[PDB]
Amino acid sequence: EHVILLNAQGVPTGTLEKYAAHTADTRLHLAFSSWLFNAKGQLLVTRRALSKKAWPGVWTNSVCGHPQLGESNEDAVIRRCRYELGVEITPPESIYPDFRYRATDPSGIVENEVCPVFAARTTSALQINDDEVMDYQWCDLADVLHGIDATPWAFSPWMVMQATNREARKRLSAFTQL
Numbered sequence: 001e002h003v004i005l006l007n008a009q010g011v012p013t014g015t016l017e018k019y020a021a022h023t024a025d026t027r028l029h030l031a032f033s034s035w036l037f038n039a040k041g042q043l044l045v046t047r048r049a050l051s052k053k054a055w056p057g058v059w060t061n062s063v064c065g066h067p068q069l070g071e072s073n074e075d076a077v078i079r080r081c082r083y084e085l086g087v088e089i090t091p092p093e094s095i096y097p098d099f100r101y102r103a104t105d106p107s108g109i110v111e112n113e114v115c116p117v118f119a120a121r122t123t124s125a126l127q128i129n130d131d132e133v134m135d136y137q138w139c140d141l142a143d144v145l146h147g148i149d150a151t152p153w154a155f156s157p158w159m160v161m162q163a164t165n166r167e168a169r170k171r172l173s174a175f176t177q178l
Ligand SMILES: [Mn+2]
Pocket: 003, 022, 029, 031, 066, 111, 112, 113
């Protein structure tokens, strides 16, 4: 499993194995992010396992990851939801297409990515993968956004920045509406 390096203008330049890519000087690469809602409209918030290299044990949006060579962002989203959650989803739909970010976790790890954000719906029961996720909560988006506005540090930096963007928020809030 790798990561696709990117230059200033967002043009692929190479490939770096994932574990070796994330350090105290991580280079810009391709990534994605997704917020999943169940049939009933409940938002799925997950907690990253204690063993993850970056932001271990942190609460964040449903699923996020790295697209591989020759893989579309939407197929990447689908692959990680089956891998990390063992769950099926509806065609992932844009929420925040131009999302870019750089943050530094508790032990100096840095994430530097161009992260298009997507939202989707769950079409099957969760089959949590213990190596990736240690816990999860099905809740009201309203609350989650309230928590993010009050205590941001309690969640992943990207979950915060994503829901702090006006358009993304309105889009997430309407997402469950028929
Ligand atoms: Mn990354």
